């Protein structure tokens, strides 16, 4: 599950979410130790 | 307020430490103590009729390049504090106007 | 993340060139749904 | 189009404060009237600005508890601060700015933003809280 939180917001536009800014956690190196990362993800590959 | 010691003759460059995220419509501000502020330039090289044609900003091409401002020239009375305000398409409405420049010879 | 404004994509047609290209696609529309019709274009009605 | 403020400098702490603002030379129909408020030990603060359909905008730093009504019979402009704080002693600002538009895309999609510069601007009246 992915935190998405809109990369303009009250920046520009209708507050638009074209794009959203989407942190969730993975295991990086050990399968144990999972850190948090993030990307930015369309609108159109993310369902709520 | 921040502080800039100069002297007299040799040019100054002077930035403000706003940083642009997109593209920057920044205006300087010269706010001489007791007198009211008089606009250097806009658009980032537009000065209004009346200021002195030795002030150039830099143009906005190329994002990237940092909002810097020539007083070349400086004057033995330029002791004021300027101002840049920025405006770009992403930080929204500047409301704030920016951190002061206090300038000493 | 991106670097400068958050722009839209689009794509650019010419005017003038798809209105011409346009009334050549009628013309031959009026071979096979007789001469005197009106033809009209609409957009995509439903689907992916 | 110098403008001419009259402040009296002396309002009670949690009172009306009102600042009037002469325009001089032309009239007030196509520009937008901004008011900035500068206090010791700091630079000056954006307020707002009012003009076109009279919706006057204000700082988000100010809990838009001040009112920015513009007069055309006078032409004044006024400010009518409420629930002041006694350390609001700042000199008020009188002056206008144009509102500028800068493109970066096309502008059918809503690519532009609006900038205001501030053309002329007024000595101003210093006023404190006593
Ligand atoms: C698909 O089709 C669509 C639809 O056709 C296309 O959509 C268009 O896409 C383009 C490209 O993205 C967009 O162009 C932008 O235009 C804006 C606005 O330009 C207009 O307004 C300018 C200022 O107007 C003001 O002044 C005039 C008087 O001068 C006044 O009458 C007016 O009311 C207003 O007050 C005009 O100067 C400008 O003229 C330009 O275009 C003429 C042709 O139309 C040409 O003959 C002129 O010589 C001149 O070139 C035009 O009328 C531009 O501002 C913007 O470019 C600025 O912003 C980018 C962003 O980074 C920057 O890189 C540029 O360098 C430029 O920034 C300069 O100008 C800023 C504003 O003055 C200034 O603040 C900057 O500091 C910077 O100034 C420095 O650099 C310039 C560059 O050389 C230099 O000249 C200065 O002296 C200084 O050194 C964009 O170009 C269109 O808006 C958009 N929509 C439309 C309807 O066109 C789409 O692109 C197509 N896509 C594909 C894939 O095909
Ligand atoms: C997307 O959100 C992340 C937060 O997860 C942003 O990253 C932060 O950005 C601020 C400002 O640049 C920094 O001060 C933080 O240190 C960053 N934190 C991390 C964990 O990276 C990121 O800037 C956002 N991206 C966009 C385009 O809005
Ligand atoms: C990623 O995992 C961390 C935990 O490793 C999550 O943070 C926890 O969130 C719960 C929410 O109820 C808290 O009770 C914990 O105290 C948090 N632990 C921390 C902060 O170390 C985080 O929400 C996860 N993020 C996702 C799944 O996007
Ligand atoms: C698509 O792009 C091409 C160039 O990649 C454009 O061709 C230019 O057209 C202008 C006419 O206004 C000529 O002056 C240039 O010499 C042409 N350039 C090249 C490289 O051929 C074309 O106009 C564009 N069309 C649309 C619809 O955007
Ligand atoms: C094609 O265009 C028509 C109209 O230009 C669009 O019709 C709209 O459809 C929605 C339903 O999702 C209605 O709520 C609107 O009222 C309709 N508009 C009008 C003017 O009737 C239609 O969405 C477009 N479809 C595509 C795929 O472009
Ligand atoms: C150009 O477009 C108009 C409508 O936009 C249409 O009536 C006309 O027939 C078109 N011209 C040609 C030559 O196709
Ligand atoms: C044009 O109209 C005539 C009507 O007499 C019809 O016979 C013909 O199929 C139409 N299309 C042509 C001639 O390409």
């Known amino acids: 599950t992915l935190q998405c939180t809109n990369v303009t917001n009250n920046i520009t536009d209708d507050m638009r979410g074209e794009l959203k800014n989407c942190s969730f956690n993975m295991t990086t190196e050990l399968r144990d130790k999972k850190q948090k990362v993030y990307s930015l993800f369309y609108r159109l590959d993310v369902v709520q | 307020v921040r502080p800039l010691s100069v002297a007299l003759g040799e040019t100054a460059r002077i930035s403000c430490g706003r940083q642009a995220l997109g593209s920057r419509a920044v205006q300087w501000y010269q706010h001489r103590p007791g007198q009211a502020p008089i606009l250097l330039i806009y658009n980032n090289q537009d000065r209004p009729s009346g200021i002195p044609e030795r002030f150039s900003g830099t143009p906005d091409i190329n994002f990237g390049t940092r909002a810097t401002l020539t007083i070349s020239g400086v004057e033995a009375g330029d002791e004021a504090d300027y101002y840049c305000h920025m405006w770009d398409s992403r930080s929204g409405f500047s409301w704030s106007f920016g951190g002061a420049t206090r300038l000493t010879v | 993340d991106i670097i400068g404004d958050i722009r839209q994509a689009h794509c650019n047609v010419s005017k003038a060139t798809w209105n011409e290209t346009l009334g050549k696609v009628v013309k031959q529309l009026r071979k096979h749904f007789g001469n005197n019709t009106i033809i009209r274009f609409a957009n995509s009605s439903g689907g992916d | 189009v110098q403008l001419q403020e009259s402040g009296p400098g002396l309002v009670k702490p949690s009172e009306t404060l009102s600042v009037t603002c002469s325009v001089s030379?032309?009239?007030?129909?196509?520009?937008?009237w901004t008011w900035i408020r500068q206090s010791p030990g700091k630079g000056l603060e954006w307020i707002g600005y009012?003009?076109?359909?009279?919706?006057?905008t204000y700082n988000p730093s100010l809990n838009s508890r001040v009112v920015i009504s513009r007069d055309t019979s006078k032409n004044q402009l006024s400010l009518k601060l409420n629930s002041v704080t006694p350390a609001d002693t700042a000199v008020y600002y009188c002056?206008?700015?144009?509102?500028?538009?800068?493109?970066?895309?096309?502008?059918?999609?809503?690519?532009?933003?609006?900038?205001?510069?501030?053309?002329?601007w007024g000595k101003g009246t210093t006023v404190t809280v006593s």
């Open positions: 002056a206008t700015a144009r509102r500028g538009q800068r493109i970066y895309g096309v502008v059918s999609f809503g690519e532009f933003f609006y900038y205001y510069s501030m053309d002329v």
């Open positions: 030379g032309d009239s007030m129909n196509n520009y937008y």
């Open positions: 009012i003009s076109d359909r009279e919706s006057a």
